[PDB]
Design a protein around this motif. Structure first.
Motif, PDB file in Angstrom:
ATOM      1  N   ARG A  42      31.188 -11.686 113.918  1.00  0.00           N
ATOM      2  CA  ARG A  42      29.835 -12.017 114.446  1.00  0.00           C
ATOM      3  C   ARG A  42      28.905 -12.478 113.320  1.00  0.00           C
ATOM      4  O   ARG A  42      28.305 -13.532 113.395  1.00  0.00           O
ATOM      5  CB  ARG A  42      29.326 -10.714 115.062  1.00  0.00           C
ATOM      6  CG  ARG A  42      27.924 -10.928 115.638  1.00  0.00           C
ATOM      7  CD  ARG A  42      27.736 -10.036 116.868  1.00  0.00           C
ATOM      8  NE  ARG A  42      26.928 -10.851 117.816  1.00  0.00           N
ATOM      9  CZ  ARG A  42      25.656 -10.600 117.972  1.00  0.00           C
ATOM     10  NH1 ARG A  42      24.966 -10.094 116.988  1.00  0.00           N
ATOM     11  NH2 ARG A  42      25.077 -10.856 119.113  1.00  0.00           N
ATOM     12  N   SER A  43      28.770 -11.699 112.282  1.00  0.00           N
ATOM     13  CA  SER A  43      27.866 -12.108 111.167  1.00  0.00           C
ATOM     14  C   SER A  43      28.119 -11.249 109.926  1.00  0.00           C
ATOM     15  O   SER A  43      29.170 -10.665 109.767  1.00  0.00           O
ATOM     16  CB  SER A  43      26.454 -11.868 111.700  1.00  0.00           C
ATOM     17  OG  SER A  43      26.284 -10.482 111.967  1.00  0.00           O
ATOM     18  N   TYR A  44      27.158 -11.169 109.045  1.00  0.00           N
ATOM     19  CA  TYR A  44      27.338 -10.347 107.815  1.00  0.00           C
ATOM     20  C   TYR A  44      25.964  -9.957 107.246  1.00  0.00           C
ATOM     21  O   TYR A  44      24.939 -10.241 107.834  1.00  0.00           O
ATOM     22  CB  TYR A  44      28.124 -11.253 106.844  1.00  0.00           C
ATOM     23  CG  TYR A  44      27.208 -12.263 106.190  1.00  0.00           C
ATOM     24  CD1 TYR A  44      26.761 -13.377 106.910  1.00  0.00           C
ATOM     25  CD2 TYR A  44      26.806 -12.078 104.864  1.00  0.00           C
ATOM     26  CE1 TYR A  44      25.912 -14.306 106.300  1.00  0.00           C
ATOM     27  CE2 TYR A  44      25.956 -13.005 104.254  1.00  0.00           C
ATOM     28  CZ  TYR A  44      25.508 -14.121 104.972  1.00  0.00           C
ATOM     29  OH  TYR A  44      24.669 -15.036 104.371  1.00  0.00           O
ATOM     30  N   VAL A 101      35.615 -13.070 100.287  1.00  0.00           N
ATOM     31  CA  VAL A 101      34.331 -12.554 100.844  1.00  0.00           C
ATOM     32  C   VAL A 101      33.262 -13.641 100.768  1.00  0.00           C
ATOM     33  O   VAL A 101      32.599 -13.944 101.740  1.00  0.00           O
ATOM     34  CB  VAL A 101      33.956 -11.371  99.955  1.00  0.00           C
ATOM     35  CG1 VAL A 101      32.667 -10.729 100.473  1.00  0.00           C
ATOM     36  CG2 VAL A 101      35.082 -10.335  99.979  1.00  0.00           C
ATOM     37  N   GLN A 102      33.102 -14.250  99.623  1.00  0.00           N
ATOM     38  CA  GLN A 102      32.090 -15.332  99.498  1.00  0.00           C
ATOM     39  C   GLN A 102      32.402 -16.416 100.524  1.00  0.00           C
ATOM     40  O   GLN A 102      31.532 -17.133 100.979  1.00  0.00           O
ATOM     41  CB  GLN A 102      32.249 -15.867  98.075  1.00  0.00           C
ATOM     42  CG  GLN A 102      31.894 -14.766  97.073  1.00  0.00           C
ATOM     43  CD  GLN A 102      31.280 -15.395  95.821  1.00  0.00           C
ATOM     44  OE1 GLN A 102      30.248 -14.957  95.351  1.00  0.00           O
ATOM     45  NE2 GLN A 102      31.875 -16.410  95.257  1.00  0.00           N
ATOM     46  N   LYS A 103      33.647 -16.529 100.899  1.00  0.00           N
ATOM     47  CA  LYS A 103      34.030 -17.550 101.903  1.00  0.00           C
ATOM     48  C   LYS A 103      33.577 -17.106 103.294  1.00  0.00           C
ATOM     49  O   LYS A 103      33.176 -17.909 104.111  1.00  0.00           O
ATOM     50  CB  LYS A 103      35.554 -17.631 101.833  1.00  0.00           C
ATOM     51  CG  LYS A 103      35.986 -19.097 101.855  1.00  0.00           C
ATOM     52  CD  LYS A 103      37.370 -19.230 101.217  1.00  0.00           C
ATOM     53  CE  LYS A 103      37.230 -19.264  99.694  1.00  0.00           C
ATOM     54  NZ  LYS A 103      37.304 -20.708  99.334  1.00  0.00           N
ATOM     55  N   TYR A 104      33.631 -15.828 103.571  1.00  0.00           N
ATOM     56  CA  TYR A 104      33.194 -15.351 104.911  1.00  0.00           C
ATOM     57  C   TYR A 104      31.668 -15.292 104.968  1.00  0.00           C
ATOM     58  O   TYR A 104      31.070 -15.495 106.004  1.00  0.00           O
ATOM     59  CB  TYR A 104      33.805 -13.957 105.066  1.00  0.00           C
ATOM     60  CG  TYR A 104      35.171 -14.081 105.700  1.00  0.00           C
ATOM     61  CD1 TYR A 104      36.165 -14.841 105.073  1.00  0.00           C
ATOM     62  CD2 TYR A 104      35.442 -13.442 106.917  1.00  0.00           C
ATOM     63  CE1 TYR A 104      37.430 -14.963 105.661  1.00  0.00           C
ATOM     64  CE2 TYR A 104      36.707 -13.563 107.504  1.00  0.00           C
ATOM     65  CZ  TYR A 104      37.702 -14.323 106.876  1.00  0.00           C
ATOM     66  OH  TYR A 104      38.949 -14.443 107.455  1.00  0.00           O
ATOM     67  N   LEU A 109      30.029 -17.278 107.763  1.00  0.00           N
ATOM     68  CA  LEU A 109      29.192 -16.537 108.750  1.00  0.00           C
ATOM     69  C   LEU A 109      27.723 -16.945 108.598  1.00  0.00           C
ATOM     70  O   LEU A 109      26.866 -16.123 108.343  1.00  0.00           O
ATOM     71  CB  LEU A 109      29.368 -15.055 108.402  1.00  0.00           C
ATOM     72  CG  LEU A 109      30.645 -14.516 109.052  1.00  0.00           C
ATOM     73  CD1 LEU A 109      30.821 -13.038 108.693  1.00  0.00           C
ATOM     74  CD2 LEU A 109      30.539 -14.653 110.572  1.00  0.00           C
ATOM     75  N   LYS A 110      27.425 -18.211 108.752  1.00  0.00           N
ATOM     76  CA  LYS A 110      26.011 -18.680 108.615  1.00  0.00           C
ATOM     77  C   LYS A 110      25.499 -18.421 107.195  1.00  0.00           C
ATOM     78  O   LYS A 110      25.790 -17.407 106.594  1.00  0.00           O
ATOM     79  CB  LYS A 110      25.208 -17.872 109.637  1.00  0.00           C
ATOM     80  CG  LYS A 110      24.420 -18.825 110.535  1.00  0.00           C
ATOM     81  CD  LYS A 110      23.378 -18.034 111.328  1.00  0.00           C
ATOM     82  CE  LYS A 110      24.086 -17.103 112.315  1.00  0.00           C
ATOM     83  NZ  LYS A 110      23.409 -17.343 113.620  1.00  0.00           N
ATOM     84  N   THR A 111      24.738 -19.334 106.656  1.00  0.00           N
ATOM     85  CA  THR A 111      24.208 -19.147 105.275  1.00  0.00           C
ATOM     86  C   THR A 111      22.983 -18.224 105.295  1.00  0.00           C
ATOM     87  O   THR A 111      22.205 -18.253 106.227  1.00  0.00           O
ATOM     88  CB  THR A 111      23.815 -20.551 104.812  1.00  0.00           C
ATOM     89  OG1 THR A 111      24.963 -21.387 104.813  1.00  0.00           O
ATOM     90  CG2 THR A 111      23.233 -20.482 103.399  1.00  0.00           C
ATOM     91  N   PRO A 112      22.847 -17.432 104.258  1.00  0.00           N
ATOM     92  CA  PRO A 112      21.697 -16.500 104.167  1.00  0.00           C
ATOM     93  C   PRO A 112      20.422 -17.261 103.792  1.00  0.00           C
ATOM     94  O   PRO A 112      19.821 -17.015 102.765  1.00  0.00           O
ATOM     95  CB  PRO A 112      22.101 -15.539 103.053  1.00  0.00           C
ATOM     96  CG  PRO A 112      23.070 -16.302 102.206  1.00  0.00           C
ATOM     97  CD  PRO A 112      23.735 -17.326 103.092  1.00  0.00           C
TER      98      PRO A 112
END
Length: 71
Positions: free
Chosen positions: A25-27, A58-61, A65-68
């Motif tokens: 879903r997200s992060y 992780v940096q890939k997910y 998962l949408k950019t912060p």
């Protein structure tokens, strides 16, 4: 204001495994008021898991998962 601002949760258990994007879903990154520091991934059911920003996967997910983009 129907936004979000209650992500107060540190991390202490990184999982090594690519979650199924169908159930993802997200992060979210850990808060500055945490004894430690790490990233977090969330599934579509509400299962939020912690992770490390160092692991390339992780940096890939995180980017997937949408950019912060929080200004």
């Amino acid at each position: 204001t129907r936004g979000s601002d209650i992500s107060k949760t540190c991390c202490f258990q990184y999982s090594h495994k690519p979650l199924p994007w169908t159930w993802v879903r997200s992060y979210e990154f850990t808060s500055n008021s945490c004894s430690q520091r790490a990233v977090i991934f969330t599934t579509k059911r509400g299962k939020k898991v912690c992770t490390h920003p160092r692991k390339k996967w992780v940096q890939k997910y995180i980017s997937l998962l949408k950019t912060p983009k929080q200004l």
